[PDB]
Amino acid sequence: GKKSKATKKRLAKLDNQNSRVPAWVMLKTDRRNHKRRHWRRNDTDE
């Protein structure tokens, strides 16, 4: 497919939201990413 500049921006964001809760946050809160979307098992909008 051919994506637009906007679609590409959205895909970029989703890829980013797909990162882990940093190590320090675990310590800072004395102790999950409920938005872990897998490219195969999951499906994105559009």
Which amino acid is residue 3, in one-letter code? K
Residue 20 phi/psi, 5-degree rounding, is -85, 160
Residues in the interface with RNA (CB under 7 A) total: 12
Q: How far apart are the first and last CA of the chain?
A: 12
- DSSP SS3 for 14: helix
Nearer to RNA, 27 or 38 (CB): 27
Q: Measured from the CB of residue 37, what is the shortest distance to RNA in angstroms?
A: 17
Site for RNA in 1-46 (CB under 7 A): 4-7, 9, 24-25, 27-30, 46
Q: Which residues bind RNA (CB under 7 A)?
A: 4-7, 9, 24-25, 27-30, 46
